Structures are given as structure tokens and as C-alpha cells.
Symmetry: C3
Subunit: 490 residues, 3 copies
């Protein structure tokens, strides 16, 4: 007749890591790392992204004739740009402050293209010959569609003076440019006037552009260049243009109607007619996990990114330090299904495994609260944001990279170290709960049984099946059976 | 006759937190998080801040007529600017490198304004007509006070050639500007010469400015603009000006006399006739706490800033795992008052509580060192710093924000998780102490007493007051009571 | 007859620190902090650094005559520049985008200088008179060696139009400049033409420079100035120059022939004819430690930098929580040399110390895995990178300093805290191992021996050497001796 104290065992092969031991097989564990993605671009909470295909942001905004698909865009959730878009600037040149514009686009969800300067507004200039073979449409020379390349009419280019007063209640993004002619003859053939300028003024802009007539290398078959500029025209302000040549004038502008969180994503994976709450450039995530290792650059409600390949929290015991688990109790009980700790009883009346629901719920509550506390502390982590730099901005670009990679390393260490330390603490917690139950039965039985040291108490007397129950309840009468044990001794 | 091992209990209501359990009621605790402020701006270590009221830094340095109170400014400890000061550049335009200038002022505590170019130096130019209705003073057109808007005199504007040599040993801040006229007629009416320039040279400066005569929107009633510039003139260098018009000459310049720690605080909170060692834009801090959650931007000897709402360290024990505290000892004793651990005796002469000074003093040292160690580990933390950016520096501004918020989240997690883990260890430390003291007494008594299971030992022999003390003294003589206890065992 | 449990003791004075206690003398300990350096500059894996001595990067690349030593530099590992080099721009002026050029250079291991435009390319210009006493050589006026200050010939300066196509298959760094003359007479005396320009154009570059003819302060005896500019001509692109004066033409250019890891170190420390794998501006490191506190800016396979003065890991035991070590055992054993824990026996055959191999090995494996896990987690620490900023870039310079200092503080805290926390656990780990060993012999001997409480068990029977061994072996035969012990009892 004997009562035993033991712990759960099963056939779980899930492993966890600790500071002192790797690949410790536990009865119960919880993965906290998401490692899977649907491999496709999806709508973000019902709203489709804007996929520019082979067109860049500059080709869309200025109206590269190969980008007609986006002459009018519905509202987007985010913008997808392929890494090296073919249709960028059909006519060689530049777009000033291009990275500051992209940063501004990242906080905009909808444009409305409005005509602000009709071509009828230029009665004394030519508005139909401003085309180039560098900007082909259907094999024929063309140009950007949102601006107009004005040239001379009847061998004259009168001085332009025009003002647009923004009458909408939303800000307007407006683009214009300057053409850099190739030589003094071409300068005259196009604009007649040999010494030209472009003036642009608002309440804050005070720009003067002068053509640079020089020899340059051919790009897209052209030695000329076009330098484009942009501004944000505030609701009740006006923009004033003055030019005697080389003016690429605004025709259409963009009314910024919806502002909100967005990003310009560099991805080439295809749209998949799906919805998600979390998008990465490699694919969407559907997960309640607190961590993921898919990609740093995400948008939406996402898990926290880590470079970890494994993040598994030990919730259960060591499968088959305080000296109980794998100590004087050498192995787990597979026949014990309910509860994490309990007793095995043996007498003439019967035999069976009985769980200690009191000690078990204490352990489940603590183990569960630890998992919740761990998840809660990682709500506020560093999240990378898309910042673009140009070729003479390589120091701040490198500072950016080192900062974003720095924080990511800090949080990767924080997540992996916390799991290791608390896994160790959790295993030691189960070991302590078993010994406290072994000491609960002891100091209650006393010399009514000999403690064999294997976790069992060999009763010198005999126990009813209800006798074993009373100790499991926590109340047991030592004097009632004190007499039978003395005779059994010797 | 018995002796019991037990621990402290009081009417404390303080709650601390651990990884497994929230809201644990302990007997003693140490809050480390200051959460209150006086809601006012104050002097810093006896030095008043420079409150610019509604004047910008630009308005003070150039000398907006609305800023005349700041003509002579005493030494300051920090500068207070409203978020949108209304007295800023009364004549529209810009101040070049204004954020870089604000950055220099953050390391400056006092200027000495000096007259470097008197109006008598302009005998062939008009010095009393450079006024505008955009810069009103007392119901008449006026102008910035520290610069001079020079005009043609007798319908002439002879070329200016002037040098100022810094003969002071202090660095000199000098400001000048250019006026952009509105059309060719106004250019003649103001400065007879139609084609003008400003040249400015030092040992490192080589600047040429040319007015931009174009049409702009009216701001503060003016379609003109004034662009201002600045430089620091080293102690033996000279600045050389040449101009045939549109020149806004210096008159007064600022000698940097005191360099040190200061900040451009942004706040509209009022001055409260107070002194502090620690100042935030929402209020001043008077605390010895190691942490605060008032505001990231502080100046002076301040606590470390965290986003936490609660940061309370456990120092005492759980109020009313090794298995003693709330284990076989069901609860603490209110009647034990001079220590955390001790004994309760009961004999024929009476009863009473006694604290074990040895074990309580060891636990006090360990708990105090843990508190001190945690404060010391938090000595070096991220300190947010005011850095300013303009409308086309939003990428770097966004970089700055994410870095300062990212370090804040890292150190907030560190503070909170360390308090959680160390609070758990502290409670288990108290529980272990009590078990080791229980075993210490169990070691002396052996079979001369009985282990009840609740922390008490029922003596088999008679133990008077001197014998009770010997068990507390650690000098219990077992052989002196051997036979009586053996007789009582029957 | 008697068997004791106890633990190792030695003559160690090594001390570790814990959260609750500092300066704990432990039996064995592992330093993880490197604190020493040879105070010299060395080759990096057999490659000698480029030591510019008193020449700046600008003086080297432009070819300041006082830098001739660096006319043909072999491949380097890192570049060493003094903090304030004396031979910088001998003719005063600037090098544009200098900090960005230094950032490109920090990723370059070898230049091959080539002659791209020889002086024969200038038949109608004077090529021997472009010298200055600001750039002495051998007591006579000279000039930068890689660039040609062209001058009028026969009182004429024909317009220069030249193109260079990069026919090499590697990137080409090209430099050029513009001379700002001092007045209209000097302009004519040097270039005949009063109104001059320089145009430069590539596939991406479209630059126009115009002399600024103004009064400036004398620097190195010159009121004039030279502004220099650079570009990277890609392997099949062309650069086009046009000018009618003030042009400082390229002569030699630098082919980028090896790209690689490198850095521009600021140091006055001497080369010492040494080799290293890890270099620091104050000295070289020869070390296998995982952490060092020498300097944040290193190059090579280096330890991770912290601000700590001490980082020592407890690997062994407290020297002479669970209540065994310095508890009921109360002291270590000097006679016990072959393990951390074990037994001292005493019988009629003699006495002697013996170690428990199993419990010692289990502790050796755990502590070794602890040390390795701590080192492994700190492999991805922040690595500071040298980044230079000019006088009007003080905001981003401060942002940079704060970021690198903030990560340094974060990772210093992580190291000190993890060493503190794991040290405390390790000492407890040993305490628990001793107790579990003590309780292993207990529960096996049972009432066949008496429990002294000082760690020893007094046998009530005769335990010969094999009986003593069976206790260490775990094969004690309880029934064989039971009657002899009950006979000795009472
Ligand atoms: C072109 C030139 O040498 N100008 C010097 C000027 O000579 C003029 C003369 O050519 C003309 O015929 O007559 C007028 C008067 O009607 C002038 O006399 O005379 C100045 C003084 O009167 C010179 O200034 C002295 O220049 C010094 C520096 O000498 C160097 C130098 O070492 O940098 C001499 C070099 O040969 C010369 N470089 C070249 C390529 O010709 C340079 C060059 O002139 C400057 O670097 C360009 O700014 O100057 C000292 O600066 C001294 O203080 C100053 O008086 C004119 O240099
Ligand atoms: C009007 C015209 O065609 N003038 C002759 C040039 O065509 C010719 O230079 C050639 O130009 C080629 C590109 O031709 C376009 C273009 O960019 O596609 C055609 C456009 O009609 C024209 N646009 C305007 C407003 O005139 C455009 C324009 O002239 C340039 O873009 C201005 O920079 O050129 C191609 O580049 C060839 O390589 C080139 O030879 C020149 C020289 O032969 O003579 C002109 O009469
Ligand atoms: C063209 C000209 O030189 N003068 C007269 C115009 O100034 C005037 O335009 C009006 O000017 C108004 C503001 O008038 C001031 C001002 O800024 O307050 C008055 C100043 O005395 C004058 N300053 C100087 C130094 O001469 C100032 C100055 O001309 C401008 O700043 C130069 O930019 O103008 C106000 O803006 C009105 O809305 C504007 O019409 C016209 C019309 O009255 O007559 C001109 O002769
Ligand atoms: C821990 O203690 C705090 C109270 O000090 C509890 O916070 C309040 O809980 C009630 C609902 O139970 C809310 O209505 C209050 O708004 C909470 N905040 C207060 C009073 O400041 C908290 O819920 C407790 N947490 C647990 C797990 O028991
Ligand atoms: C500003 O004033 C000082 C004092 O006159 C000038 O420095 C002196 O210049 C003269 C002639 O060049 C020398 O003889 C003195 O030895 C110089 N004294 C000192 C302390 O430098 C200085 O040249 C002037 N600064 C400028 C840019 O002209
Ligand atoms: C832990 O388990 C995985 C998969 O079985 C294995 O790849 C890995 O090598 C194991 N780690 C160790 C230390 O054995
Ligand atoms: C644009 O029109 C509105 C309405 O009259 C007017 O208030 C405003 O001043 C105009 N803005 C400019 C820059 O002319
Ligand atoms: C607890 O006891 C102290 C002293 O008796 C008393 O000052 C205090 O008010 C009490 N606190 C509470 C919450 O009752
Ligand atoms: C401590 O013991 C070791 C073993 O011989 C010895 O090498 C060392 O020098 C000793 N140190 C002192 C201070 O005795
Ligand atoms: C620890 O040891 C060092 C060197 O012996 C000593 O400087 C320091 O004062 C000691 N610290 C404490 C708390 O005793
Ligand atoms: C340089 O020479 C090659 C020869 O193939 C030519 O293809 C190339 O276009 C030239 N580069 C320029 C900018 O003309």
C-alpha cells in the first residue's frame, strides 16, 4: 500500500531552448514566431494598392505616355513600385526633390487630377509640336501628358505671364519644368529668344530657372535635358509663372483629397485578388502570432519583426533547479492525462492516477499569465519606414540603414533572450510545484509511511481508497492509524 | 509548549507586479516613477528662461519691431518659443539656414548686441526710408531694427565697398539680406540701378546674391521678399560687402559671450515664478525618482524618461517558490513588529513574538543593493533632444522622430521588464529566507520536538524562557533535553 | 564511521558581481572584457594602411605639392588621417561634397591614377604659368599636381570644348575646379575674357559655374579662391567640358580598381611595424574576448565594444537561496581538487576526498552552455561607423552622435545586466547542485545513519571502502545493514 507523487508525461516532441540547455523536449509549448506568408500582394482592409507595374512614381506623376493606365487612379491603400521601373523619365533630365516628394506621397491616399491651365491659354505660342522620340506613344513622338512643352509661333515666343489661383479647398501638387537646349542654334529654332529664364512665385516660392546650354551625353537618344520642379499650392494661394522660353508649363495638377498612412513598397510579386490586414513586399501575413520573420518593411496591423528562426515558449514540463522532476521522481506518468501534477494511488481496494487540480490551476494560471505578459511587453517595438535617398546623400542613407538595423538587432536579442530566461524559469517552476506537493503529502503522513525516495510513500498501515482521497484533499488524521505502523515496524 | 517560524504582515496596501502574477500585495515597496509636475515653466537653478512670448528666434535676432522687449536680453538658461510665433519676419521672405542657426543657439546662453556699422557710414545712401507697413511700429511703417534697408540718395546708388574686422575676442554673429523687388519700375524707384548684386566675402565665405524681380503673391500686404543670411565671423577675420543695390546692411551684431547648455523649448505654458532643477515643456519636476513619465524633452538634472504608468519595486514580502511564505506557513503575523522574519514562542510562562535580526539584516542588505543596483544600471539612458527641420527636410525629420521614439520604447521595455523579473526574484528571495530559518531551527531541535506542518515545533520536553531564547540564539543544547523528550515519545 | 557532502574551495581571489551582492569571491571565473592594446597602428591581415601623415584626403587627391609622397599609393587596408592635417588646400577654397567623397573612399581599397588629359591637349592655352606661392615646391611657386590652372596664351583664351570618354572598364573619379579672381584687371591679366563660365556635363551631370569676382580676406596670402568639384564617370560614359576662362582642368584621374572594406581613421598614433586582425585609432587589439572597451570605431574581426570597465562571468562556486553552500555545509574543501562537489569518507580503512563526476559534469556542461549562449546572443551588436559632417550639417551630426551613443548605451546595459543576472543564478545553481547531491545520499541511507546537519551522515553500521563507494555510486544496499543499525540505535 503506497501513495505516489509524480508529474505529467506525454508523446510531445516539441523542443525549447534555455540558457543552460538546448533542445529540451517539453510536454507543452507555444510558438510565438510567424514564419509563413501567402506570397502575393493583397488589398489592405478592403482597399486595393496602386501597382505602377513598369512605371515609376515620376512617370506616373508627370504622365509618361507609357503610363496611361494611371491617368486617373482610384484611392489606394499603398503604392507598389518595381525596383527598376522601365518607364521613368522618357525625356532625360531630373525631378527636383524627388525623394521628398515620395516621402510626401507616403502620407497620401488619393489624388484628383484637375486641368488647371488649358492649352487654349497660349494663343501666341505653339502647343502641338512639343514632342520627342524619347517619349514614344504608339511608335510616334509624344511627351509627358500633364505638362506642355511650349515652342515658338510665327518665329516668336512672347513673354508669358500667367497666374493660377487655387480655388479648391485642398492642396494642389503642381509640376513644371525647364528644357536645357543643346546649342545656340537649337535654342533659336525652338524659342527664338536666345537668353531665357523662367520665374515662379507663390507666397513662399521665389524661383528663377535659367537654361544651361551645353554639350551632354545622349540618354534615350537625346542630349537635351528637362529639369522638373514641384510645389504644394495651399488652398487660397496662387502660383505665378513668367517665361520667355524653355518653359514646360503645367496643364494638369493633382488635388490631394485623401491623406493617410501608406507606403511605397518595392515588390515585383503579383496582385492576388486577396484581402489582408498586414502586407510585406514578399507576401501577406495572416497571423495572431506576436512575432514574424518575413520582412522588415510592413504596413498594417502586423507582428513584430525579428531575425529569429525559432521562438518557442515552454508552457509544459520536461517530457520523459529543485530536486523533484528528473530528481527523486525519476520519470513522468503517461497514464496521467488530466492535470500537470498529482498522485498515483495503490492499495488492495484499487489503483489509479488522480490529479491535484489545486496545484495544477496555480501552474496553468502562472504559465498563461507569463505568456500574456511577454506578448504585452513587445507591443511597442521599432517599425521600419521607407526612406529614399539620392546618390550624393549616401551618409544619411547609411545612418538610416544602421539605425533601422540597429533597433532590429536590439529587439531580436530582446525576444530571444527573454524566451531563454523565462523558459528556464518555467521549467524550474514546475520542479518547484512538484516538490511543494511532495512536501504537502509529507509532514502530514509522517512515520505512518516510509518514504522510499522515488516519490512514493510506502504506507506502514493500509489505506482505504477513501484514505488516499483524504490526503489528496489535504486533510488526513495521523493518530487514527499510528497504532498499526508500530507493529509493522520490526 | 511550541516555537513557530513566521514572517511579517502589516496594513500595507501597496501592490507590485511580477511576470506570473499581477497586483501582488506586499508589506513594503519602493516607487521609482515620478508622475507629477507643477504645470508651469520655471527658472533653472536660479536662471530665468528667455520667454520670447509671440516672437520667433528670427524675429528677435533680426529685430522685428514687435520684439523690442528683447533688444537687451539677460543671460538665459533655456529659450521658450511658442509653436507658431506670430511676430516672425514682418516683411515676408526667409532666413537662410534657420534650423542650423537654431542649433547654434541651443549651445548659447547669452549674446551681447554691438553696433558694428553705424548709419553715419552711409553718407551717400538714404538710411531713413527703408520702412514698410508690413513692419509697423506705433502706427507707422517701420522695419527690422538690427539691419538697414538702404535706398538711393539724390536719385543715385553708388557701389558700396565696406569691411568690418572682428576686433573682439568673441565670435560675432552677423545678419544681412537682399530685397527682391517686384518689377523694373520699382527697382529703379528704390535703387536707381536696374541690374544689381550683393557680394559677401570672409576667409571662408564667398557669396554672390542677385535680386529676383518677378511676380509673387502678397503676404502681409507685400509682394516683395527679403532673404536674410548669417555667418559667424571668427575673432580676427573680416567680412567684406559690395553691392550696387537691393542690399539690407547689418547695423547690430551679436557677440557670443556665454556658451553652454540650453534648449529651444516649445511650449505655451506660463511662467510660474518658481525654480527647478528639471524642466519639461509641460511643467517642472521636483523629484528624486530615477524615472519620470512627464515629457521626453527635458533640461537640467532630470530623471530618465519612460512611457510607463507604474514602476514600483518590491522590497518587502507578500502581505496577508520555496514553499514557506503562503505555503506551510499560511500567513504572516501582524504581531511581529521589529523585523521581517522571526519566531513566536508559547510556553507555561507565556508567549510572544521575536524577530531574527541576523536573517532580516541579510535580507535588508540584499534588497537594498538590488534597488541600488537597478538605479545605477539606469544611469546612462537615451535623452531626447530638440532638433528642428524645414518643410523639405521631412525624411530626416521622420528619421529623427523614429530614432528618439525607438530608443524610448527600448528603454521603457528595459525598465518595465527588469522591475517585473526582479520583483519576482525578491518575493522568492523572502520565501527562501524563511525556509532556511525554518530548517535552521529544525536542525537544532531534531527529535526533541515535533514538526506540526504549519511552521511550528511542538517540544517533547519543557522549554522555559531561557531555553526558548537558546533556539533563537542558535545555542540550543540538544543533549540537555535528550532523555525527557525520549520519555515523552511513547 | 562517516560520509560527508561538501564542495570545492581554492585560493582564488577572482571576484564577480551580482544584483544583490558585489565583489563575491568565486572559485573560477571567466573574463569576457578586453582592456589592453599595443598603442600602435598596424597592418590589417598583412595589408599596410595608407598613412597620409600631415596631408588631408583633399590634399592627396588634388595633389598638393607637399603631398608628393602619395603620388602612387599601393593598395591599403584603411586610411589614417590626422584630425587637423596641415597640407590640405594650399590654394584656399573648397572641395565640394567633401564628406560624401570621403564616404565613397571609405569603401575603396585601391586607386590607379591615369593620365586622362595631357598638356599637349592645350595648344592654344598657357599650361606652365598656373602656379602660386600658396602652393610652394622647393622654394618656388607651384600648384596642385593632378589638375591644370590654364591661362591665356598670346593675350587670348579661346573657348575650350573637350570630351573624355571613359574607355576603361572601371569607375573613374575626376576632379576639376574654378578660380574666382579678385578684380576685373586680374581677370583680364589671367584670362583676357571678362565674362566667363565653366560647363560640365556627363550622362547625369549638368553643371554651370561662373567666377565670383569679389573682395575676400587673405588666406595663405591669397585673396583668390579655387572651388573644386568631383564626379564618378561610369565605365562607358563621357564628360564634356566647356569654358572661356577660370577653368582648372583635370589632368590625372583615379580609376577605382579595388572596392572593399576600409575606413578613414583619425589618429596621430605611429605605425609600429606590427600586424593585427583588429585595429583601433588608439592601438591594435590581440584578443579572443567577446567584448572590448578600447574604442568604438574599429576595423577588422573585432570584439564588441562596450563602455564597461569590468565584465566577469562566474563559472564556479562561492569561495571560502538553496540552503546548502555557506548554509548547513558552511564551508568548502581545499582537499577536494578533482571536482566541484562530492564526498569525504571516514572509516577504519582510512579517510579521503572523492568527487561526484555526474553532478560535477552536469554543472560543467550547464555553465559552459551558459557562457556560450551569452556570447552567441551578443554576436549582432551595434557597430559604429565613421561619418563626417561639415559646419552647416550640425543637426545631422548631432543626430548621428546620439544614435551611435544610444546604441552603445543600450548594449553596454545589456551586457552588464545579463552578466549580473546570470552570475546570481550560477551561484544558486551550485547551491542547488550541492543540496540535491546531499539529498541523494539522504533518502538512500535513511535511518541506517544519523543526519548531523553539517553536511555529514554518521553511519550506525560499518561502511567499508566498497560500502562507501556504493553510496557515491548510488547502489547502497539498505536491507543488508538495517539490523546492524537498529542494534546500534539505543
Ligand atoms: C596675373 C598676375 O600675376 N597678377 C599680379 C599683378 O600683376 C599685374 C600685371 O600682370 C599687369 O601687367 O600690371 C598690373 C598693374 O598695372 C599688375 O601689376 O600684380 C599684383 C601686385 O601688383 C600681383 O599680386 C601679388 O601676387 C602675390 C602672389 O603671386 C602669385 C602667387 O604666388 O599666387 C604669383 C603667380 O605667378 C600668379 N599665378 C599665375 C597663374 O599667374 C598668382 C596669381 O596672380 C593669383 O594667385 C591670382 O589671384 O599670384 C600675392 O598675392 C601678393 O599679395 C600680390 O600683390 C598679381 O598676382
Ligand atoms: C524640329 C526638328 O526636328 N529639328 C532637327 C532635329 O530633329 C535634329 O536633331 C535630331 O533630333 C532627334 C530627336 O528629334 C526630336 C526628338 O527629341 O524626338 C524631334 C522633335 O521634333 C524635336 N522637338 C522640337 C520641340 O523641336 C526635338 C527637339 O528638336 C530636341 O528634343 C531639342 O532638344 O528633337 C535625334 O535627337 C537626333 O539624334 C538628332 O540629330 C537637328 C540636328 O540634326 O536638326 C534639327 O533641324
Ligand atoms: C513702385 C514703388 O516703388 N512705390 C509705390 C508702391 O510701393 C505702391 O505699392 C504699394 O506699396 C504698399 C506698401 O507700401 C510700402 C510698404 O512696404 O509699406 C511703403 C514704403 O514706404 C515703401 N518702401 C520703400 C523703401 O520705398 C514700400 C516699398 O516700395 C515696397 O516694399 C517695395 O517692395 O512699399 C502696399 O504693398 C500696396 O498694396 C502697394 O500697392 C504703388 C501703389 O501705391 O505706387 C508706387 O509708386
Ligand atoms: C490591478 O489593480 C488595479 C486597481 O488599482 C485594477 O485597475 C482597475 O480595474 C477596474 C476593473 O476591474 C477598472 O474599472 C479600473 O479602470 C481599473 N483602474 C483603476 C481603478 O485605476 C486592475 O484591473 C487590477 N488588475 C488585475 C489583473 O486584477
Ligand atoms: C583684422 O585686424 C587685425 C589687427 O589689425 C589684423 O591682424 C593684423 O594684420 C597686420 C597686417 O597684416 C599684422 O601686422 C598684425 O600682426 C596682425 N595682428 C593679428 C593679431 O593678427 C587682421 O589682418 C585683420 N583681419 C582681416 C581679415 O583683415
Ligand atoms: C535541435 O532540433 C533541430 C531539429 O531536430 C536540429 O536541427 C538541431 O540541430 C537541434 N539542436 C541541437 C543542439 O542538437
Ligand atoms: C485667390 O482668390 C481669393 C478669393 O478672392 C482671394 O481671397 C485670394 O487673395 C486670391 N489669392 C491670390 C494669391 O491672389
Ligand atoms: C496603517 O497603519 C498606520 C499606522 O498605524 C496608519 O498611519 C495608516 O493610516 C494605516 N493605513 C491604512 C490604509 O489604513
Ligand atoms: C594558487 O594556487 C595555484 C596552484 O598552484 C597557484 O598556481 C597560484 O600561484 C596560487 N596563488 C597564490 C596567491 O597563492
Ligand atoms: C571591490 O573590489 C575592488 C578592488 O579590490 C575595490 O576597489 C572595491 O572598493 C570593492 N567594492 C566593494 C563594494 O567592496
Ligand atoms: C564612348 O565610346 C563607346 C564606343 O562604343 C560609345 O559606344 C559610347 O557611347 C561613348 N560614350 C559617350 C557618352 O558617347
Amino acid at each position: 500500500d503506497q501513495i505516489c507523487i509524480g508529474y505529467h508525461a506525454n508523446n510531445s516532441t516539441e523542443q525549447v531552448d534555455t540558457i543552460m540547455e538546448k533542445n529540451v523536449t517539453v510536454t507543452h509549448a507555444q510558438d510565438i514566431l510567424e514564419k509563413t506568408h501567402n506570397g502575393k500582394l493583397c488589398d489592405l482592409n478592403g482597399v486595393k494598392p496602386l501597382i505602377l507595374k513598369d512605371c515609376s512614381v515620376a512617370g506616373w506623376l508627370l504622365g509618361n505616355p507609357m503610363c496611361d493606365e494611371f491617368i486617373r487612379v482610384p484611392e489606394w491603400s499603398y503604392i507598389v513600385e518595381r525596383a527598376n521601373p522601365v518607364n521613368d523619365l522618357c525625356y532625360p533630365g531630373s525631378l527636383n526633390d524627388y525623394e521628398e516628394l515620395k516621402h510626401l506621397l507616403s502620407r497620401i491616399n488619393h489624388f484628383e487630377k484637375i486641368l488647371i491651365i488649358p492649352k487654349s491659354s497660349w494663343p501666341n505660342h505653339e502647343t502641338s509640336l512639343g514632342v520627342s522620340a524619347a517619349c514614344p506613344y504608339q511608335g510616334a513622338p509624344s511627351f509627358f501628358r500633364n505638362v506642355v512643352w511650349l515652342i515658338k509661333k510665327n518665329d516668336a515666343y512672347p513673354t508669358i505671364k500667367i497666374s493660377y489661383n487655387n480655388t479648391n479647398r485642398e492642396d494642389l501638387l503642381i509640376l513644371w519644368g525647364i528644357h536645357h537646349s543643346n546649342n545656340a542654334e537649337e535654342q533659336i529654332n525652338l524659342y527664338k529668344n536666345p537668353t531665357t529664364y523662367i520665374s515662379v512665385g507663390t507666397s513662399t516660392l521665389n524661383q528663377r530657372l535659367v537654361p544651361k546650354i551645353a554639350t551632354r551625353s545622349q540618354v534615350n537618344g537625346q542630349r537635351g535635358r528637362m529639369d522638373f520642379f514641384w510645389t504644394i499650392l495651399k488652398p487660397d494661394d496662387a502660383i505665378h509663372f513668367e517665361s520667355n522660353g524653355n518653359f514646360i508649363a503645367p496643364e494638369y495638377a493633382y488635388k490631394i483629397v485623401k491623406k493617410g498612412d501608406s507606403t511605397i513598397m518595392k515588390s515585383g510579386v503579383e496582385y492576388g485578388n486577396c484581402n489582408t490586414k498586414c502586407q510585406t513586399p514578399v507576401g501577406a501575413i495572416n497571423s495572431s502570432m506576436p512575432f514574424h520573420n518575413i520582412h522588415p518593411l510592413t504596413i498594417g496591423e502586423c507582428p513584430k519583426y525579428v531575425k529569429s528562426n525559432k521562438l518557442v515558449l515552454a508552457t509544459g514540463l520536461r517530457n520523459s533547479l529543485f530536486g523533484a522532476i528528473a530528481g527523486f521522481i525519476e520519470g513522468g506518468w503517461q497514464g496521467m492525462v488530466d492535470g500537470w501534477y498529482g498522485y498515483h494511488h495503490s492499495n488492495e481496494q484499487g489503483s489509479g492516477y488522480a490529479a491535484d487540480k489545486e496545484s495544477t490551476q496555480k501552474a496553468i494560471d502562472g504559465v498563461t499569465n507569463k505568456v500574456n505578459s511577454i506578448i504585452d511587453k513587445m507591443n511597442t517595438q521599432f517599425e521600419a519606414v521607407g526612406r529614399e535617398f539620392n546618390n550624393l546623400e549616401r551618409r544619411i542613407e547609411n545612418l538610416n540603414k544602421k539605425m533601422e538595423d540597429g533597433f532590429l538587432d536590439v529587439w531580436t536579442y530582446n525576444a530571444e533572450l527573454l524566451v531563454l530566461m523565462e523558459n528556464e524559469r518555467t521549467l524550474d517552476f514546475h520542479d518547484s510545484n512538484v516538490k511543494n506537493l511532495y512536501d504537502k503529502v509529507r509532514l502530514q503522513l509522517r512515520d505512518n509511511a516510509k518514504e522510499l525516495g522515488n516519490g512514493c510513500f510506502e504506507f506502514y498501515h493500509k489505506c482505504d481508497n477513501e484514505c488516499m482521497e483524504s490526503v489528496r484533499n489535504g486533510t488526513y488524521d495521523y493518530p487514527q492509524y499510528s497504532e498499526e505502523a508500530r507493529l509493522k515496524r520490526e
